[PDB]
């Protein structure tokens, strides 16, 4: 009932459509990182944000219900 893929991906209309959409997604994912937006969405430390300058303690969550406030505290300690 559905049209074979081999005719779709050898057709001109497919390549016209997808020579646009495929680079647009690939470029958008690239900028998601290079603008640094990825770090702030997910909360991942940038290479200079694992430790404060002189400490070697890990900022480990130790409380169940105050965990949100503990992480915020540790982010503040990056001055």
């Amino acid at each position: 009932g559905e049209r074979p893929f081999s005719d779709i991906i050898t057709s001109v209309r497919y390549w016209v459509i997808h020579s646009i959409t495929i680079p647009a997604l690939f470029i958008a994912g690239w900028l998601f990182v290079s603008t640094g937006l990825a770090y702030d969405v997910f909360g991942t430390p940038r290479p200079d944000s694992y430790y404060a300058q002189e400490q070697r303690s890990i900022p480990l969550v130790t409380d169940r219900f105050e965990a949100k406030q503990q992480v915020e505290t540790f982010l503040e300690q990056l001055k």
Partner: protein
Amino acid sequence: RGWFDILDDWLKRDRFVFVGWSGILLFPCAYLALGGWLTGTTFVTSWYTHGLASSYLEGCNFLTVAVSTPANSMGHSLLLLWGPEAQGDFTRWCQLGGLWTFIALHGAFGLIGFMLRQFEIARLVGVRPYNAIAFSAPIAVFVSVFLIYPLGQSSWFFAPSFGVAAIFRFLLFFQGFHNWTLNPFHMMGVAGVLGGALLCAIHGATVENTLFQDGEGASTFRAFNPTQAEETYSMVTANRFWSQIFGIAFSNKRWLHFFMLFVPVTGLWMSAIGVVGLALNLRSYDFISQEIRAAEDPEFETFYTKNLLLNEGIRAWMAPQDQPHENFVFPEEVLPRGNAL
């Protein structure tokens, strides 16, 4: 001709991707489970829960990325996005490990959905539902290792993390703390898995080498038709070969294929039972008789006592970095070590 029967009509249409009523559960939960793993291994850290980098973004590779378990302090929290810990904050949720319970719970319901799909398709096509029955074993493994085991321990932290090297760590933790290779239930599982691999290889090789010459080409794959009535290989010649090489052989084609179902499914089920015990630290750790003799006789040594020394090394050397919430400080002088090393 109510809406229910119309909706049933549409769900069960013969399309490229069968949907079924089962699909309503299977497809979202499986998609979210896989999508969460890919999202987490690409972008999300394990720094606040484990003291670890675990994403492509941090510099990990395919072998070392993981979605890691939540912090020990979370207990066995469901860790809902809207729960009291993350409080709606998607970013905190990721940093607190919420993607772990997200993948675990959506994966579990996804697995239920795949099994229901097996029943649903079997019922429409008109076959016995043994494929679904065989699939109970993967579910038993997943439920016992990823859910039951941490529920018996202090928290989700000690469950497996979803990653390649993270699972390797889980293997080694189980040797050192649980002496899991000594567990008769693991041994039965090993036999089921290896015996299944053996059966798969021997049956496939036997068929491919007792084929009937139903064509003239040197490639024998073309001399088979899906609607032929005759068997494509000789059971009689296969039985004589194995009877004379090995002493015994299959003679019943139905028993042979039931046995190919039975061996690995039973093995996985046996291993699930041992892991339930380990949820309680109900280990096969020691042989008491060996310990009494070794305590009293410093010349008695076996491969059993030798392996305990290695477990003791595993525990002391991995615990501080592996359980950072414990704040183990083991001065060098207390670390067990042999001579020189």
